[PDB]
mmCIF file of C-alpha atoms and ligand atoms in Angstrom:
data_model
loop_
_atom_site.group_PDB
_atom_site.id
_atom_site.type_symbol
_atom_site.label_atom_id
_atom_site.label_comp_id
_atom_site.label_asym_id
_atom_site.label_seq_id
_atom_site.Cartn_x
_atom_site.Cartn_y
_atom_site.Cartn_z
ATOM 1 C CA UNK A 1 127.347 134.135 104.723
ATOM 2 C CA UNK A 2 128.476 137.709 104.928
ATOM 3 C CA UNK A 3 131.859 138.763 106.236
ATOM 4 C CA UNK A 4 132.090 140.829 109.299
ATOM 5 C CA UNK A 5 134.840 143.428 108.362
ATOM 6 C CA UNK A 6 134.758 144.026 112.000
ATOM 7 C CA UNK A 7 135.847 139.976 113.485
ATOM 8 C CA UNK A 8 139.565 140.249 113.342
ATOM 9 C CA UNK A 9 138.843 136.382 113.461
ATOM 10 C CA UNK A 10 136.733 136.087 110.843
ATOM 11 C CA UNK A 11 138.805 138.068 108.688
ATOM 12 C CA UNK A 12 141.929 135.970 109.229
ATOM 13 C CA UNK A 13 140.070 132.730 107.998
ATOM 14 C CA UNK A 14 139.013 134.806 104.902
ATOM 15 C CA UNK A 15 142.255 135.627 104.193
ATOM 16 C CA UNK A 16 143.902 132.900 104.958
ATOM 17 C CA UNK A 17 141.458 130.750 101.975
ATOM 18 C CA UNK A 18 142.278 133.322 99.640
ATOM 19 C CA UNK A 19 146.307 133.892 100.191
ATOM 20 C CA UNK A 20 145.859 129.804 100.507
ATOM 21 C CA UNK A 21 143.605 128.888 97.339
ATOM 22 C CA UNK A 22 145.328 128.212 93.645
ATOM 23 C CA UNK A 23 142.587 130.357 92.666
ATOM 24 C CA UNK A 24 143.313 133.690 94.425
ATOM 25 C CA UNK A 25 143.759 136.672 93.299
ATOM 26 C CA UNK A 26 145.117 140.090 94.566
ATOM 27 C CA UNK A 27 142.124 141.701 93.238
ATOM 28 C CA UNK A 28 139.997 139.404 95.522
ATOM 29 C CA UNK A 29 141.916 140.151 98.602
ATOM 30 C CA UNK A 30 140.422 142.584 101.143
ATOM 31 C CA UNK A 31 143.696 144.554 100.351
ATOM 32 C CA UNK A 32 141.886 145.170 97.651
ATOM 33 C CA UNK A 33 139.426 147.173 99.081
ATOM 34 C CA UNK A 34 141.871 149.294 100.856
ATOM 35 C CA UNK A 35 143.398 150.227 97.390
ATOM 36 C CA UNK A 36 139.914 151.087 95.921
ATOM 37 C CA UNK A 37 138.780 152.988 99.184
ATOM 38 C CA UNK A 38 135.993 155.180 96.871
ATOM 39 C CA UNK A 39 134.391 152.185 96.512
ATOM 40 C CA UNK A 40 132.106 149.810 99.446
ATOM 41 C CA UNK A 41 133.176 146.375 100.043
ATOM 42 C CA UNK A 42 131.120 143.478 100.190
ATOM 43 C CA UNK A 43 132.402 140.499 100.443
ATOM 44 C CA UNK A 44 130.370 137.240 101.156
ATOM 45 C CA UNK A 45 131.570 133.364 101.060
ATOM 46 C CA UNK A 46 130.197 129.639 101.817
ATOM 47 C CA UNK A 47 131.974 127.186 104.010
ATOM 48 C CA UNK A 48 131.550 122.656 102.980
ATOM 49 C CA UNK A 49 129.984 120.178 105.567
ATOM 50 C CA UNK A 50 133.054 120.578 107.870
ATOM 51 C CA UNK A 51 132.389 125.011 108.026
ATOM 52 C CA UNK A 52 135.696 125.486 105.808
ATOM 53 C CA UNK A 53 135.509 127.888 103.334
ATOM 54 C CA UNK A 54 135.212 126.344 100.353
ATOM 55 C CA UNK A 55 134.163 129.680 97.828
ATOM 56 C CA UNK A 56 134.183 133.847 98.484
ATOM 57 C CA UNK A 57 133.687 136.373 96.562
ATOM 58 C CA UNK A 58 135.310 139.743 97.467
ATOM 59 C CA UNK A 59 132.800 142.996 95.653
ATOM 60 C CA UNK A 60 133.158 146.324 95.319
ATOM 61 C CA UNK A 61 130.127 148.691 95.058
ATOM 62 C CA UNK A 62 130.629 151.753 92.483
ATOM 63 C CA UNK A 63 128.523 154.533 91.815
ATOM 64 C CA UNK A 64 126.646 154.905 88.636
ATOM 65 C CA UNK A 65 124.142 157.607 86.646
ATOM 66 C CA UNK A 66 121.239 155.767 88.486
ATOM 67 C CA UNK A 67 119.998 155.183 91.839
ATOM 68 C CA UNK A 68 121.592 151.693 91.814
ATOM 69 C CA UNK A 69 125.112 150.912 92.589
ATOM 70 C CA UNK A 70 127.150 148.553 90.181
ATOM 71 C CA UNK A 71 128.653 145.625 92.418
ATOM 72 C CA UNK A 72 132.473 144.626 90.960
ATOM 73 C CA UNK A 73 134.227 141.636 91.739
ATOM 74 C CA UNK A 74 137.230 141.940 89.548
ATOM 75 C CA UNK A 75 138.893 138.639 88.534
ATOM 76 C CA UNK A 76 136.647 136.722 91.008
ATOM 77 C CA UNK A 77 134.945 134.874 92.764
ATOM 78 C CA UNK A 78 137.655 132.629 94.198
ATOM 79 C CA UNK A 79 136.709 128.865 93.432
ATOM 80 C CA UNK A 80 136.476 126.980 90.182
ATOM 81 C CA UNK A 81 133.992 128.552 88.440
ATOM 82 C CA UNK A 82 133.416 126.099 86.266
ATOM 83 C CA UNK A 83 131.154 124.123 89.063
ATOM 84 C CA UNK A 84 128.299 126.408 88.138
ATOM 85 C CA UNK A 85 126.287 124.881 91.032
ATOM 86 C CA UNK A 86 128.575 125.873 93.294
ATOM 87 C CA UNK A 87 128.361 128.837 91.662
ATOM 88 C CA UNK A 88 125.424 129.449 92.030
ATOM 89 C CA UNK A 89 124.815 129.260 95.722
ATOM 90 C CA UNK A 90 128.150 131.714 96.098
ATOM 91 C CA UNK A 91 125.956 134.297 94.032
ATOM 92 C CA UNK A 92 123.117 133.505 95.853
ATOM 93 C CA UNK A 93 124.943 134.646 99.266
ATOM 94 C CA UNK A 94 126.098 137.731 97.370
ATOM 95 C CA UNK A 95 122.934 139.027 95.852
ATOM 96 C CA UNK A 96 121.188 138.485 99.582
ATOM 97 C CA UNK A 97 124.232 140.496 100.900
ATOM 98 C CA UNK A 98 123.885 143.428 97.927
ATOM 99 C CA UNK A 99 120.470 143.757 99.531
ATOM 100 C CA UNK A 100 118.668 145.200 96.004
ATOM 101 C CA UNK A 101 121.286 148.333 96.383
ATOM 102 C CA UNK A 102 122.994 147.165 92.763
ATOM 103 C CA UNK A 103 121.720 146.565 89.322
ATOM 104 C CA UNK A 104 123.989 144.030 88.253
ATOM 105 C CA UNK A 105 127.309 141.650 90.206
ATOM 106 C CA UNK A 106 129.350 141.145 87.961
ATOM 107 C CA UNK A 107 132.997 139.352 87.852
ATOM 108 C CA UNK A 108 135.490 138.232 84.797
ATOM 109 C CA UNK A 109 137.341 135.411 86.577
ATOM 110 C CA UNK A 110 140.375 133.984 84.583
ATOM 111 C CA UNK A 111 138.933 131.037 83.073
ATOM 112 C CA UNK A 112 139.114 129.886 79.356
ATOM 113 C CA UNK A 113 136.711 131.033 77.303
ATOM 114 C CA UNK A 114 134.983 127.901 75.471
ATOM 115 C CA UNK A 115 131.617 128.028 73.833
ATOM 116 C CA UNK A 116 130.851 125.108 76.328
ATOM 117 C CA UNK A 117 131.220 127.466 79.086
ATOM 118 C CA UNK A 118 130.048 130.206 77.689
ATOM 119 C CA UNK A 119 126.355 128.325 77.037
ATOM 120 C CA UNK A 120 125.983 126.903 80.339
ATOM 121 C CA UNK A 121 126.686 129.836 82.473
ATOM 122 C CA UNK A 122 124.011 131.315 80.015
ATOM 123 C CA UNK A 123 121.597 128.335 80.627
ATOM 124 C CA UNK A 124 121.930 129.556 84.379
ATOM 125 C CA UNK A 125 120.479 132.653 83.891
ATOM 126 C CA UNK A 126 124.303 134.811 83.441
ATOM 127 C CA UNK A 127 124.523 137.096 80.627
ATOM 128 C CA UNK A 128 128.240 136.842 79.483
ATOM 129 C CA UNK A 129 130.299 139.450 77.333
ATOM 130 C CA UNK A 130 133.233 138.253 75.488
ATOM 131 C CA UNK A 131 133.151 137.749 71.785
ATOM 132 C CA UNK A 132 129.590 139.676 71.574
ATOM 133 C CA UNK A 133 131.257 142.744 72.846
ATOM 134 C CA UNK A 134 132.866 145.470 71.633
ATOM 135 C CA UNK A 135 137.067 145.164 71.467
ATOM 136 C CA UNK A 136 137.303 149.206 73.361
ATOM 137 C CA UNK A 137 135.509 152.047 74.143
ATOM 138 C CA UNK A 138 132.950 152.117 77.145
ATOM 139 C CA UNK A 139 130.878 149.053 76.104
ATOM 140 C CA UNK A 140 134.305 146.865 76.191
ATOM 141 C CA UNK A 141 135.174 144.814 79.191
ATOM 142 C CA UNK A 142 136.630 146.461 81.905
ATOM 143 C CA UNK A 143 139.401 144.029 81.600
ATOM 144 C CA UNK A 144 141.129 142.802 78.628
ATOM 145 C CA UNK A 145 140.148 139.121 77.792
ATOM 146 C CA UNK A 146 143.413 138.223 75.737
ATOM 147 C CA UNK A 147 146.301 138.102 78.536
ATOM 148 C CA UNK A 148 150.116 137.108 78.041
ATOM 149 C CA UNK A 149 150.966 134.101 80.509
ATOM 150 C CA UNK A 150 153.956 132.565 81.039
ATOM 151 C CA UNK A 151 153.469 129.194 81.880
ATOM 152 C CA UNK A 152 156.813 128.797 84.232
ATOM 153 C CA UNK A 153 155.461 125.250 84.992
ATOM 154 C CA UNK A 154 156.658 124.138 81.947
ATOM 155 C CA UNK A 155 160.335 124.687 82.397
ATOM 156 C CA UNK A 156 160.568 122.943 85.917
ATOM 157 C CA UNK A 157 164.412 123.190 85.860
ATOM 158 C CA UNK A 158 164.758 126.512 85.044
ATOM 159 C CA UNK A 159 166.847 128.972 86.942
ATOM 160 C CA UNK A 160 167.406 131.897 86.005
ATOM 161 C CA UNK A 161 165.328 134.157 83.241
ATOM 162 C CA UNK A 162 167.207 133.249 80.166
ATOM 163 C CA UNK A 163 166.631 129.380 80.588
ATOM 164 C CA UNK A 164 163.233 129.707 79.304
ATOM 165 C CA UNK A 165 163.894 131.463 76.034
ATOM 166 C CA UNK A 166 164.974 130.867 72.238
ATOM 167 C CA UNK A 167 168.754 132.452 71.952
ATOM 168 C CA UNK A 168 166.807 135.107 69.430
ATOM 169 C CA UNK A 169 165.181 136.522 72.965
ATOM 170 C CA UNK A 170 168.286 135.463 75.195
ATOM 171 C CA UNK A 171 170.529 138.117 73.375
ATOM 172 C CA UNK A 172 167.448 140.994 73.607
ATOM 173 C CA UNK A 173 167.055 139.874 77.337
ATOM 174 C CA UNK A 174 171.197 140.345 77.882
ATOM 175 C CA UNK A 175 171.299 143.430 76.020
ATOM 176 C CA UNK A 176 170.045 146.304 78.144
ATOM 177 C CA UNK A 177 171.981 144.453 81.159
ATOM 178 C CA UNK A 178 175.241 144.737 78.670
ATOM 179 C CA UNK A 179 175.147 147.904 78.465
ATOM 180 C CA UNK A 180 174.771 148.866 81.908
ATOM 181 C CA UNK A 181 171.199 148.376 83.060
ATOM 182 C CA UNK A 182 170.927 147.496 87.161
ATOM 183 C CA UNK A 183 167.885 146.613 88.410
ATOM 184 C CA UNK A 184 166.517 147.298 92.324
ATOM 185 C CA UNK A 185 163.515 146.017 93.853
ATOM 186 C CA UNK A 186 161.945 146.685 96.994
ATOM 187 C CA UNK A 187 158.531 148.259 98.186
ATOM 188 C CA UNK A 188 159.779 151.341 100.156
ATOM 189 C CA UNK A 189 158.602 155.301 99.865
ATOM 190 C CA UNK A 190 161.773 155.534 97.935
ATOM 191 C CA UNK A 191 160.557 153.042 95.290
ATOM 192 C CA UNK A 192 157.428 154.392 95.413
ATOM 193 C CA UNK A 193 158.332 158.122 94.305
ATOM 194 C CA UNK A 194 160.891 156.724 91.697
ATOM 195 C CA UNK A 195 158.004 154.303 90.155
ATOM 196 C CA UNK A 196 155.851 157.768 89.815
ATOM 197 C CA UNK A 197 158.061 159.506 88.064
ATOM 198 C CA UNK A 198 158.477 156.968 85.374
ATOM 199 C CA UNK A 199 154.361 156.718 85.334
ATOM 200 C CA UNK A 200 153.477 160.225 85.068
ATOM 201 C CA UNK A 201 156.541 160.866 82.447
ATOM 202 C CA UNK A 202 155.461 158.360 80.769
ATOM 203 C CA UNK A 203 151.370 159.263 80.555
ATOM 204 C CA UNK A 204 152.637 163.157 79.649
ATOM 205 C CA UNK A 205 154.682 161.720 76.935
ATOM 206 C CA UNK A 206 151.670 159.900 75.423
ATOM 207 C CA UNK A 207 149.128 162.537 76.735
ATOM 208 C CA UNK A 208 147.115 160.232 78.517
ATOM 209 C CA UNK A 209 145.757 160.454 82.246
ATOM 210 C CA UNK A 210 147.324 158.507 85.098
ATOM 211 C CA UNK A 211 146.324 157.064 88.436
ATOM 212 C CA UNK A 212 147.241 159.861 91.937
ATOM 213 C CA UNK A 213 150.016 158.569 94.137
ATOM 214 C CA UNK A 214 147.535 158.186 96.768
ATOM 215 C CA UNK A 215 146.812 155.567 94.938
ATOM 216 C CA UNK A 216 149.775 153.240 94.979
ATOM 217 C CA UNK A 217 150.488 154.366 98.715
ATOM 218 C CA UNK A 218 147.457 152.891 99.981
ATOM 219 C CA UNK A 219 148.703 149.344 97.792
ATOM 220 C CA UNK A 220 152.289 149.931 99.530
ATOM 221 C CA UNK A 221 150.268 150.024 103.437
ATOM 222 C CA UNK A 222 147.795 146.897 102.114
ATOM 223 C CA UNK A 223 150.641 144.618 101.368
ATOM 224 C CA UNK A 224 153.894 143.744 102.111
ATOM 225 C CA UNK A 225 157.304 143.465 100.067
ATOM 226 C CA UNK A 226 156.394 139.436 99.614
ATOM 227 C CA UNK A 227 153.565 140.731 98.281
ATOM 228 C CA UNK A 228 153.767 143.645 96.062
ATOM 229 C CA UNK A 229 157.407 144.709 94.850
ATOM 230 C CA UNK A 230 158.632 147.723 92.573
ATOM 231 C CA UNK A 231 161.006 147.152 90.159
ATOM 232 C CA UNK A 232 163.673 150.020 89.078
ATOM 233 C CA UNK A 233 165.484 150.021 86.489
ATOM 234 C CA UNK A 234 168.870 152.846 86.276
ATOM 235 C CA UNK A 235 171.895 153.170 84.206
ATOM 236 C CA UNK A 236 174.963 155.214 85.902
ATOM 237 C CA UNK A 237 172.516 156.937 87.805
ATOM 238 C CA UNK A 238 169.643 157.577 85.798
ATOM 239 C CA UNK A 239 166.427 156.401 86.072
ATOM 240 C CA UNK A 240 165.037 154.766 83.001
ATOM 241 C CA UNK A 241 162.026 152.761 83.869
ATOM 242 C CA UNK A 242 160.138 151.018 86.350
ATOM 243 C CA UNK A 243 157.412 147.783 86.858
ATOM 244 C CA UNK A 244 155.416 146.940 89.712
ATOM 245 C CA UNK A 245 154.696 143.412 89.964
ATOM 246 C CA UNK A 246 152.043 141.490 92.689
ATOM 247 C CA UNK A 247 152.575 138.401 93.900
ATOM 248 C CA UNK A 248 149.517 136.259 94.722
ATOM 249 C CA UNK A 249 147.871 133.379 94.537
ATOM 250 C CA UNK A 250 149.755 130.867 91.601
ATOM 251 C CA UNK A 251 151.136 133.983 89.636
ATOM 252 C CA UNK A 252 153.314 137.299 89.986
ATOM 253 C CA UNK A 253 151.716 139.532 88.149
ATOM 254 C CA UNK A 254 153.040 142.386 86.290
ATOM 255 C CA UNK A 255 150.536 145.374 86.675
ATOM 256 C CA UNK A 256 152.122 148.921 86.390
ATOM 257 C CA UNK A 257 154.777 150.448 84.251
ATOM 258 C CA UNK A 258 156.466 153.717 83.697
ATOM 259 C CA UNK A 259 159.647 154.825 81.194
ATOM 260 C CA UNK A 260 161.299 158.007 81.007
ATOM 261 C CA UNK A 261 161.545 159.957 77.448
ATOM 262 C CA UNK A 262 164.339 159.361 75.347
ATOM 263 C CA UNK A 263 166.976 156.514 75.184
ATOM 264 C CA UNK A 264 166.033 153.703 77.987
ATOM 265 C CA UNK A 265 168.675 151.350 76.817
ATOM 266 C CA UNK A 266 165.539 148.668 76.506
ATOM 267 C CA UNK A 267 165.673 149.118 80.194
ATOM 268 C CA UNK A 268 161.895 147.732 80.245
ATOM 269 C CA UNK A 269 163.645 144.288 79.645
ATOM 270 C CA UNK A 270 165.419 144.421 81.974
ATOM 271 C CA UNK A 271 162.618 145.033 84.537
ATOM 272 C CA UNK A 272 160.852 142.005 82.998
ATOM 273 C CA UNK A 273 163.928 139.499 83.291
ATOM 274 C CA UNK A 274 163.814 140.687 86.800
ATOM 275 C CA UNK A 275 160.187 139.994 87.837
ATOM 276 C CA UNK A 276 160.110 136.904 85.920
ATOM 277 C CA UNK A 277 163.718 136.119 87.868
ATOM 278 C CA UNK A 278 161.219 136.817 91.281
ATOM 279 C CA UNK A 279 158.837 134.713 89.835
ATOM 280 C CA UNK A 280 161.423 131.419 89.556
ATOM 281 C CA UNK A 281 163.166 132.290 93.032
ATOM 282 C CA UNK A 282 159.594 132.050 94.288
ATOM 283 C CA UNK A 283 158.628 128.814 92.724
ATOM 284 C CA UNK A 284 155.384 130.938 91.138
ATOM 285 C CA UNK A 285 153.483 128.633 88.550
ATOM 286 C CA UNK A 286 152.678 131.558 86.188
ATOM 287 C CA UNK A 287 154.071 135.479 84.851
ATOM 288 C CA UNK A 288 151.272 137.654 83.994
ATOM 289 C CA UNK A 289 152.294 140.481 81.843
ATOM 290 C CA UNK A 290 148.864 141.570 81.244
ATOM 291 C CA UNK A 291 146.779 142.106 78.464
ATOM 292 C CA UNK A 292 146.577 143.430 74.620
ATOM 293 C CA UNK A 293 144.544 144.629 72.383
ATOM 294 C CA UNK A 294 144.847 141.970 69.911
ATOM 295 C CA UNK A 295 147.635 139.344 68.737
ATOM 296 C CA UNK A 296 148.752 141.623 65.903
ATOM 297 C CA UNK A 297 152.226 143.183 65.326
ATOM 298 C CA UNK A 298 150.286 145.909 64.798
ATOM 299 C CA UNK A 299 149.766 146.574 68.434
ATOM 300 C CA UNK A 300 152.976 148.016 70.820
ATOM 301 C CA UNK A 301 151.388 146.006 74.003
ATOM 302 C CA UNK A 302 151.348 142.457 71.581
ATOM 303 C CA UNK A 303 155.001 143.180 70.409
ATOM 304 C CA UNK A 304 156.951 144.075 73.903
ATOM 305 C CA UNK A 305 154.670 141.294 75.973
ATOM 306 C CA UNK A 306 155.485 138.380 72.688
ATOM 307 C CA UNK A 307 158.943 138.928 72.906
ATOM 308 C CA UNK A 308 158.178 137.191 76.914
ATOM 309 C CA UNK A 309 155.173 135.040 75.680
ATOM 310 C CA UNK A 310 155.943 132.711 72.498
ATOM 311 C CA UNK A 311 152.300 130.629 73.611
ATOM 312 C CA UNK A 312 148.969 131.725 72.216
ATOM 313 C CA UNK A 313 147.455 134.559 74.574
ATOM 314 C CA UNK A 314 144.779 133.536 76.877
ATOM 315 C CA UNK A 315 141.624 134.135 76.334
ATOM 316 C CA UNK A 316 139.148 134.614 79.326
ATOM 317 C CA UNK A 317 135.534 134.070 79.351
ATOM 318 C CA UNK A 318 135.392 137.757 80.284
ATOM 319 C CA UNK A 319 132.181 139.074 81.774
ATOM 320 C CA UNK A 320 129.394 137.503 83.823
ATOM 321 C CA UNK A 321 126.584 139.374 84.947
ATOM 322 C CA UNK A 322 124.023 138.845 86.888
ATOM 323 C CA UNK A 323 121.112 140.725 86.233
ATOM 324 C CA UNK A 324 119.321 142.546 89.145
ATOM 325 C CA UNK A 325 117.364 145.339 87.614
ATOM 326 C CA UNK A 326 116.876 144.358 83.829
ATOM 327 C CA UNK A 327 116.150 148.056 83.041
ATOM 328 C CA UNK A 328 118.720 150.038 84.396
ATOM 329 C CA UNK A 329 121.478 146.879 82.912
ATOM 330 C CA UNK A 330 119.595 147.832 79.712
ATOM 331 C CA UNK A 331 120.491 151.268 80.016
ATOM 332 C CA UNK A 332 124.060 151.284 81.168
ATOM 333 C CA UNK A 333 125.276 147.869 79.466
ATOM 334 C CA UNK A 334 125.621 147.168 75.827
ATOM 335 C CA UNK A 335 127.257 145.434 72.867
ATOM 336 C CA UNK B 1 144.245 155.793 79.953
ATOM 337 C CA UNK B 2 142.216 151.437 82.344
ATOM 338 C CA UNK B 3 143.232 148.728 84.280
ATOM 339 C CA UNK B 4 143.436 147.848 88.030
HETATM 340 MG MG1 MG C 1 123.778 157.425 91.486
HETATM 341 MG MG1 MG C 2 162.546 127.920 91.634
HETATM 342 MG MG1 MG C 3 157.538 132.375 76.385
#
């Protein structure tokens, strides 16, 4: 079935399955939606023999060259995807709700990649793109398939930060706190502005382009401080750099940096010790710190996000699309 | 410059 946006009841039981299920993610939540408010939610879902919800799939409708729209749901559906039956019937409810207005639904749920997997959801009619694909540029995935997870399952006595880590990374961790690091965290205005001027310093420094604070407003008014929480790193009054970190689902995940020019004092660690430290108060089965662009010394993202994660990346299936209009998926989509 |  569909989701009436406009049942303040049937909205709570939506939410509740995803905030509930050890598959949710933030991306999946109609917060979502509030955050990307340029693009049209649909969001559909199935309910077992009792009328629970048992699978949903949160999309996002985008705008392309053509006179179909691309439907997006980004790091879903929410269910184990790996019952491609069941998966099949959730898609089935989604393309009826898409109504022929897209060319292609895709989503790059965070599942192993395996060549098992991979086969099957092709024997089901999916084209996939992981491996086959491009590593950047526009025929990459729209999210990176190698991700840095901390598996805080592992260490089930662990209390603070530093219990999880080799002394090498212990005394790195301690440092920028040594000499004088102090981390905040909240989710207030004041938070807010501070986190932006770390961001855009830090995208003028490498003279890249960066997200409006519009942006991160609308995530501050679609979720709470349990929920979302900026971290801020200062040292005697200056501010050296900042993290924003989600909580959802089994993992906190850290999604947004910024760092002032200049000395930091390896402040960035400090923001890390801090959201992982949120992550054990919390009892949170996993740290996400994202993706890189491959597991080479050779790449800044690999070096900072090893020093958190000694394990082997992840590696996620990545894309699965399902085809709608074969020509114009021809046309925009490629190796 | 990506990501959500
Ligand atoms: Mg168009
Ligand atoms: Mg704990
Ligand atoms: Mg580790």
């Amino acid at each position: 079935p569909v989701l009436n946006l406009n049942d303040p009841q049937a909205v709570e039981r939506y939410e509740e399955f995803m905030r509930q299920s050890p598959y949710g993610q933030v991306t999946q939540d109609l917060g979502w939606a509030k955050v990307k408010n340029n693009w049209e939610p649909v969001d559909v879902y199935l309910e077992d023999d009792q009328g629970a919800i048992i699978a949903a799939m949160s999309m996002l409708l985008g705008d392309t060259p053509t006179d179909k729209k691309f439907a997006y749901a980004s790091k879903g559906p929410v269910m184990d995807v790996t019952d491609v039956d069941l998966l099949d019937r959730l898609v089935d409810e989604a393309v009826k709700a898409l109504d022929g207005r897209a060319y292609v639904l895709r989503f790059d749920p965070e599942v192993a990649y395996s060549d098992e997997f991979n086969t099957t959801l092709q024997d089901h009619g999916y084209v996939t793109r992981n491996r086959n694909v491009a590593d950047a540029g526009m025929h990459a995935t729209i999210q990176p398939r190698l991700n840095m997870v901390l598996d805080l399952t592992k260490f089930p006595d662990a209390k603070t930060t530093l219990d999880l880590y080799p002394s090498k990374t212990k005394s790195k961790i301690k440092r920028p706190f040594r000499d004088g690091v102090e981390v905040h965290s909240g989710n207030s205005a004041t938070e807010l502005d501070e986190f932006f001027k770390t961001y855009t310093t830090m995208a003028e420094r490498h003279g890249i382009t960066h997200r409006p604070i519009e942006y991160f407003q609308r995530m501050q008014a679609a979720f709470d401080a349990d929920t979302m929480r900026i971290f801020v790193a200062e040292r005697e009054g200056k501010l050296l750099s900042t993290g924003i970190a989600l909580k959802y689902g089994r993992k906190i995940w850290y999604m947004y940096a910024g760092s002032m020019d200049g000395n930091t004092y390896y402040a960035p660690y400090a923001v890390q010790s801090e959201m992982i430290q949120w992550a054990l108060d919390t009892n949170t089965d996993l740290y996400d710190l994202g993706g890189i662009e491959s597991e080479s010394t050779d790449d800044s993202l690999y070096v900072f996000k090893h020093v958190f994660v000694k394990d082997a990346p992840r590696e996620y299936i990545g894309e699965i699309d399902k085809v709608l209009d074969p020509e114009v998926y021809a046309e925009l989509v490629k190796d | 410059x990506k990501x959500x």
